Design a protein around this nucleic acid. Structure first.
Ligand SMILES: [Mg+2]
Ligand SMILES: [Mg+2]
Ligand SMILES: [Mg+2]
Ligand SMILES: [Mg+2]
Ligand SMILES: [Mg+2]
Ligand SMILES: [Mg+2]
Ligand SMILES: [Mg+2]
Ligand SMILES: [Mg+2]
Ligand SMILES: [Mg+2]
Ligand SMILES: [Mg+2]
Ligand SMILES: [Mg+2]
Ligand SMILES: [Mg+2]
Ligand SMILES: [Mg+2]
Ligand SMILES: [Mg+2]
Ligand SMILES: [Mg+2]
Ligand SMILES: [Mg+2]
Ligand SMILES: [Mg+2]
Ligand SMILES: [Mg+2]
Ligand SMILES: [Mg+2]
Ligand SMILES: [Mg+2]
Ligand SMILES: [Mg+2]
Ligand SMILES: [Mg+2]
Ligand SMILES: [Mg+2]
Ligand SMILES: [Mg+2]
Ligand SMILES: [Mg+2]
Ligand SMILES: [Mg+2]
Ligand SMILES: [Mg+2]
Ligand SMILES: [Mg+2]
Ligand SMILES: [Mg+2]
Ligand SMILES: [Mg+2]
Ligand SMILES: [Mg+2]
Ligand SMILES: [Mg+2]
Ligand SMILES: [Mg+2]
Ligand SMILES: [Mg+2]
Ligand SMILES: [Mg+2]
Ligand SMILES: [Mg+2]
Ligand SMILES: [Mg+2]
Ligand SMILES: [Mg+2]
Lengths: 62, 100, 88, 92
RNA sequence: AACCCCCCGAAGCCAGGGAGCCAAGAAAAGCCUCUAAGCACAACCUGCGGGAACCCGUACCGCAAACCGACACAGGUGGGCGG
RNA sequence: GCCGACCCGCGAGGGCGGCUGGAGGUAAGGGAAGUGCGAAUGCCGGCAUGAGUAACGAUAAAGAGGGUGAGAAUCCCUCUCGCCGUAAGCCCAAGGGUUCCUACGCAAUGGUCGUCAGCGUAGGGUUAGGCGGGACCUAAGGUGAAGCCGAAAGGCGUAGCCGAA
RNA sequence: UAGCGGGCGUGGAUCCCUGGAUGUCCGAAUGGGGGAACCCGGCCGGCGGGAACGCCGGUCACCGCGCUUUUUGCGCGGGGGGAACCUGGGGAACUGAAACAUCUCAGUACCCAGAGGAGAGGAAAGAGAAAUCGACUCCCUGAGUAGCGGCGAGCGAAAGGGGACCAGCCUAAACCGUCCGGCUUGUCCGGGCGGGGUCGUGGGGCCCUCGGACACCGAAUCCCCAGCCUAGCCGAAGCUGUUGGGAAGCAGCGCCAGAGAGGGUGAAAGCCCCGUAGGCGAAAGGUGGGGGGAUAGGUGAGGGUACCCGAGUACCCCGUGGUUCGUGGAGCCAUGGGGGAAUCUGGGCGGACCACCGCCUAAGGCUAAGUACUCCGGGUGACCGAUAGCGCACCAGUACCGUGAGGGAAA
């Protein structure tokens, strides 16, 4: 159901839109890196966070 | 698609074989193999476990899957086929001659 | 080649050598043979610049006749090949 | 896009010994100029790099059953941070 | 730790050295110089400073069990060092 | 499918009885064919014979003690011996492309053995402004603006471009 | 595709159908190079301290036609692929003739260029003997006839009749207006555009007369819709005994059927599951004269004038191809070479030629359907059942074999 959630947040991401788009994506991009960064070391990774964060970036980019 | 079939997760009778006539709630339904888990067919697994983690696994005689055709739904009256009636809005399913 | 107002691709056809009398009998000996169109180069002034033509001998006057049509046209400024195109 | 260049920290005693020095190293996107690496890691760790070196690593060939296999290719990258700073994240 | 004398000596170096002979022994850029267009508050030469300086290959075999000969084949394979 | 001394038929065959086997089979009477194999130096696969035979791939060469180990002529170490030394050593190129290194391991690969390996599973390892190649040039040659030619496909071809140990 | 590990779903996911977004590098590959998936740039703008460096987005190949007066630019198109089918340009040999050379194989194989769901052909300068038929394409038949032929081997029509389908059109010229530039300056030559015009009972142009307008014809183009494909939904009728590891077998008593085709369920089921009969369904995308509507275009008479009716063409000769036609008495359709007219008192043809009788209007273009094929989807089978059947039921054009075209398993 998280779809209907984040979606509206994006038209809401229209304070600054293209600007906050890049801003927000750059942030989630960092978080993604921070994720697999800790994921490779093992003792800081669960799983579902990645694919959710990935596809998260996707729709944001859309 | 179309993989859908008879009943889901609820009360169901079994006219299979080794557990004919029996009844129980269907706790699981795997559509891929077209079979459901009830409480009838339960065989003893001797194996300790496939995965080394958790030393003890169990000589458990847990529930074995069962072909989804030998099982039949049920209601106030015992054992009935399945008709369907589009509600005043949605799409519920009535039994042989009664509701749900 | 043969491309020009003529448009005559050279075609091949049989060239049979025969032996006979004509009013007694007749026999043969066959082979293929390519026939080329008699065609000649045709240089001509035409407005500014000069201009040639890899044209056939049949339609030689057709070029000069067309050169006349060209008078009723407006053309100038470096147009070697382009003239040919706009030249019908 | 700039965190996409840095892939993940290389885990080797050879990589670790670099930590003792001012040389942190890690995996990188295959097509990636040492210069763009500089700028990528520079703005990704709040540090200032001085000298970058790079390697290609032909992915070794594994197999399963009667089926041949080929691991993906990767790009090592070793950066020399300015003399007087560190990556607490890489330290770990 | 000594690490200094004497001797032989290259086909290598100074290298475009020289001599002789007849069969008469590459090309283009880097580089030096000359002027055109243009510009001459530029541009270019030199000196010092700061700054910048990428893409690919670097493992290993390599006269051979890793290359060419269906083979861990008495076969084949170019360049340098060879006390 | 395996066996039968039994019954029927001249015969090709059919019928019955036991054993196996685990799921299809198709009377009487008619129809249609990819319709019967012992041979083709027939095609495919399987298994025999020679036969425990010839051969284990350079006549440079081995012996011993210790260790590891389920098990050592063959793996590790020490000692003694022998062989190459314009090579049988060493560096580079081509080609080959992970065979390099390190753990665990021996069914097959190794012409025997194997605890070993160039083998299997896994991890790790190749760092360049100055070495080599490219953001340099040109050679044969390839290419190809213009230009020429050829039924079509295409072929010549100056400048330029590509092209190096 | 289980397992380690971590999640989503009635706030309706996973899946299926439609549209959209992203879409690295190669490849027609197209900024330049190149040993395909690599290497190097110019121009604008952004990023990092960012001038050297690097990255990101946009852009720059060539050829054709119209615009651009010029140069330069702007726009439209082309390029490449496709199993078989289709047209055009080229085009074998084995083999047959029991040899072989003309012939045959065959205009086949192959090469090449082009076309699209088709292609080609097509509204008579036709056929051919009926004072007849009436574009083209395909199926019967005509017919193994007519003929052809070292009259050997062999090759092989057409008219006509019967069917499918049905369709008919635009332009060139005479003549009027117009715009442009050229000159020997004219009442003109030519080019571009518009009007006019399209015929074989010959048609058109110009002038005169008719009253010559309302309707009549009506798309092959356009618009809406039916219907159809691209997901799906509903869907009658059974329960206990009995043998067994397992009922659907055997038994007893019932039921449905516009559904007793087939598949599955532990074995042999109309009534257990999936279905079948019958009947439902589309927001979106694709198709669609099947229906309706609009638009293009099109329609008459008589007399005179004799202006026009498609050129290196008709026609003739030399060389040849096509046709059933191999030089034969050799026409007809096409045409490499040479000569070379005319515009309806014109010109071709009806198998050399002449005459008479008669058919038809060349040298400009377009036209659906009936027809061919099957990469793709579906249905069916006196079709195979793993040495069969596609080479491949299985991660096969793979392993393996070749420098390379290419060859190519087993399972
Ligand atoms: Mg002439
Ligand atoms: Mg490098
Ligand atoms: Mg020497
Ligand atoms: Mg001499
Ligand atoms: Mg000067
Ligand atoms: Mg090295
Ligand atoms: Mg050897
Ligand atoms: Mg050996
Ligand atoms: Mg040698
Ligand atoms: Mg020496
Ligand atoms: Mg013997
Ligand atoms: Mg012996
Ligand atoms: Mg022992
Ligand atoms: Mg072994
Ligand atoms: Mg062995
Ligand atoms: Mg051992
Ligand atoms: Mg040259
Ligand atoms: Mg060339
Ligand atoms: Mg040249
Ligand atoms: Mg060059
Ligand atoms: Mg060089
Ligand atoms: Mg998976
Ligand atoms: Mg202008
Ligand atoms: Mg012959
Ligand atoms: Mg002969
Ligand atoms: Mg023939
Ligand atoms: Mg058509
Ligand atoms: Mg038909
Ligand atoms: Mg016929
Ligand atoms: Mg025939
Ligand atoms: Mg007109
Ligand atoms: Mg009109
Ligand atoms: Mg003839
Ligand atoms: Mg002619
Ligand atoms: Mg006409
Ligand atoms: Mg057509
Ligand atoms: Mg069968
Ligand atoms: Mg090979």
């Amino acid at each position: 159901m998280k779809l209907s959630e984040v979606r509206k947040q994006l038209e809401e991401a229209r304070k600054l839109s293209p600007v906050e788009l890049e801003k927000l994506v750059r942030e989630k991009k960092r978080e993604l890196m921070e994720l697999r960064f800790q994921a490779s070391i093992g003792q800081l990774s669960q799983n579902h966070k990645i694919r959710d964060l990935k596809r998260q970036i996707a729709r944001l980019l859309t | 698609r179309v993989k859908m079939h008879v009943k889901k997760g609820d009360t169901v009778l079994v006219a299979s074989g080794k557990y004919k006539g029996r009844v129980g709630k269907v706790k699981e339904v795997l559509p891929k193999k077209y079979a459901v888990i009830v409480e009838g067919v339960n065989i003893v697994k001797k194996a300790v476990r496939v995965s080394p983690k958790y030393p003890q696994g169990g000589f458990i005689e847990k529930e074995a899957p069962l072909h989804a055709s030998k099982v039949r739904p049920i209601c106030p009256a015992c054992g009935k086929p399945t008709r369907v009636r589009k509600k005043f809005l949605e799409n519920g399913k009535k039994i042989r001659v009664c509701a749900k | 080649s043969g491309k020009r107002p003529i448009v005559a691709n050279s075609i091949q056809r049989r060239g049979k050598a025969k032996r006979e009398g004509g009013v007694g009998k007749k026999t043969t000996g066959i082979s293929k043979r390519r026939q080329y169109p008699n065609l000649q180069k045709v240089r001509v002034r035409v407005a500014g610049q000069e201009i040639t033509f890899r044209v056939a001998a049949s339609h030689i006057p057709k070029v000069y006749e067309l050169v006349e049509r060209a008078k009723g046209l407006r053309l100038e400024g470096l147009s070697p090949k382009e003239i040919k195109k706009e030249l019908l | 896009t700039a965190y996409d260049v840095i892939l993940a920290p290389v885990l080797s005693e050879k990589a670790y010994a670099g930590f003792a020095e001012g040389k942190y190293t890690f995996w990188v996107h295959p097509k990636a100029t040492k210069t763009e690496i500089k700028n990528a890691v520079e703005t990704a760790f709040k540090v200032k790099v001085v000298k970058v070196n790079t390697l290609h690593v032909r992915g070794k060939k594994k197999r399963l059953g009667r089926y041949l296999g080929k691991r993906p290719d990767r790009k090592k990258a070793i950066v020399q941070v300015a003399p007087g700073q560190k990556i607490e994240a890489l330290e770990g």
